[model samples]
Target chain A: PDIQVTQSPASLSASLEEIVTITCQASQDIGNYLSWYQQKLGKSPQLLIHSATSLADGVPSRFSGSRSGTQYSLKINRLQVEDTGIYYCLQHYSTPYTFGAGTKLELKRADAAPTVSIFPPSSEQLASGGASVVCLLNNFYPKDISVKWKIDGSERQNGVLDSVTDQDSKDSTYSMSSTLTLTKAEYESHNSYTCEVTHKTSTSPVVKSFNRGE
Target chain B: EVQLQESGAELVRPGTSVKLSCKVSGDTITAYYLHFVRQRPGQGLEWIGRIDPEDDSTKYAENFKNKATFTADASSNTAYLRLSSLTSEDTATYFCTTVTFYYSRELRWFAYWGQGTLVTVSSAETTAPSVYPLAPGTALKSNSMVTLGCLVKGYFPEPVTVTWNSGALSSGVHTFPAVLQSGLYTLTSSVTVPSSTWSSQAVTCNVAHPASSTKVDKKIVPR
Candidate 1:
């Protein structure tokens, strides 16, 4: 059995130096037996607060945790740009220790739209009577984006593999790729395959197409 | 640096008991708190109990209260865990760790750990479980959810532990019962994450079996 942890707000956008708070409500009385983790893009989760209010070693004092009965809170004061990431709360009081659904934090700034590009299948792929096309989306901000593939005009939802998003540690931008594979015969039958990316920055989806004839 | 060296591998019969030891060095046992943690092959860490060597007072996780007994000899700088009336479920690696409060800051954490001691409880031969590569399940894009599964097969014993490491926290995790086939056992575990989380994080499934000394991990990196 699993204990339910409700975290809110599911997403947030704030400015630097602002005070931010995230909360998690445990399904039952877990006392002060909770911890908070901070996970930056493309990085492992780092311990920030443990045992409800104690700070982990090397963690900044600006980040603090508190508990009010079954409800726990993580508060960040004088938030820095580096504080933008996902925050999660975990209860270690019982077996099947559960984690709260993460809260995505973004520092207020200009939204960066993704640049979409598609690459054709290699000769080796064609030699094997199969082909795969890769669509790369790079330099996106906020990290919330979607990719879809359309053949000619109809949407092809299945058979598309999406890669995990990677963050540019220096710039804090995100990038990911998606691949659509098909048999040689199927690839020839389709005239054009398009990769459509939708992001908050744009009113319409960014599109990149690969034509077999070209 | 504080160091803990646990006693080596142990093989005990069902219904019997085993006493494991941990020898501490570089720090007096009475100066800090000692904890006993266990991981059954292919499972997550379980907190058994903790002992304040200074006072010899002990407290246990409710589930482990009766199954585990703790003792420590401050003079010898050693702590012990005696697991009685053992069953297949007790087959695991027991670790001894110390919880210390950092000076000035007063931050508390498990600062040191011992190389775990393996305890196999069985009346017959044991078999280790083989974990297959993780595979994708249904992607309910309509609701922005994706499921990933890990299959474990060819192992003896009824129970194995399966855990998911999804970079961040994972939600909606489910594990099926072990099914017996061809004199071996098979089990499957799955976790569901937000579609965006799956696309942005590497997820790994870890399997632990008592018969095997090493835990098996299968990972899937998006694209």
Candidate 2:
């Protein structure tokens, strides 16, 4: 006995400055109780519209919400590159609140493969008897990439951390970095460290390696 | 820079009432919308209600309309929620949050959350939690990472903290909510580390519960 919500065009592709619309339908009459949210990768959902048509305070005028009977719609005008994310609609009128599956919006951008580089620990780090190496990827388009680290020809899962992808507003290219730490004994082992990066534009992952002795 | 500070935890008797407070700073209370949310142990969040502080108008979810009362004092920049006829089902952690719109970022969301205040409704008895031995690390998604888990079971009153000590290792730690089982509760916390580190170091998980006089620390050494 739960209300069901249906959203249309599960995925969408649009151009900047274009008008994009996403709609949700409730199984029953839920009045003006629907709210819309936008969620970016690795970020919490941001409230865009609440109570069908009222935009949350501080939102831009380009984003709007509207309703007709049990159907609610969210519209964005003059869309920008930052508007690319997943949109979901929630019905709050009854118990067991329901949310639509969500719509994935992708802004049109030219594909660009990432350039990978690895940096070994500095002389100061060597003097301390421990070290941390960094793997940096830059100038990638579409922002979808995976990174992994390997030590001495074996994959390492622990002690590796990847940072959030950052986008340049001017060109919309993305960049990110990952780090691998080593203890004093491990640093003295003279093992080769490798960084592997996979992106949509390339069929094979880009690999780079570094050795402290080199 | 907006901040919200919720009141401290409360131990109330069943069938009584409790009032919780959320103090706001760095912003005018009247210019924002305040929301009250609650989560029963081991459950998802439930929207209790929202209040427009400027007009003192309030709107609550259908189920909370009769159970919760919300009010705001613009003069003091504080929001309050009063629950009446409290019962075991009403025991939960209540949170006060506000929607924020950042002009430079062009975004609006629940940007600030109060440190939640727990409400425990009981007659007279409290049970201490039992901490189990730390489990060995299990490889996850290839051999690059391993996860260590610790289970805490049979706790009453539902307020417990679990912490991990791995010398200098930090980050990649997750703790789940307390799940109600029978009349007691159970919870788990896990941390991930590199296989190399796990094979060379000893990790410990510490549990602290109010009802217990002594804290429990369980350690697992690499095999």
TM-score of chain B of each: 0.55, 0.67
lDDT of 2 by residue, B92-120 (tens): 87878775443322223354667677888
Candidate 1, residues A1-214, lDDT tens digits: the string is: 4567888888887877899999999999998778887765322346688888888877899999999999899999887867877887877676545667778787765578865556566544467686666666666786788898999999997666665443443455666657676778988998988889899988998888867767
> Using lDDT as the measure, which candidate wins?
1
Error of 1 at A153 (Å): 4.1
Point out the worst 10-residue segment of candidate 2 chain B by lDDT. Answer: B133-142
Q: Each candidate's fnat, in order?
A: 0.01, 0.03
- Candidate 1 — what's its lDDT? 0.71
Rate residue A140 of model 2 by lDDT.
Answer: 75
- Docking quality of model 2: it rates as incorrect
Expressed between 0 and 1, the share of native interface contacts present in candidate 1 is 0.01
Tell me the tens digit of each residue's lDDT in model 2 across A124-167: 44576746566656657877889988888888887665654434
Question: Candidates' TM-scores?
Answer: 0.49, 0.50
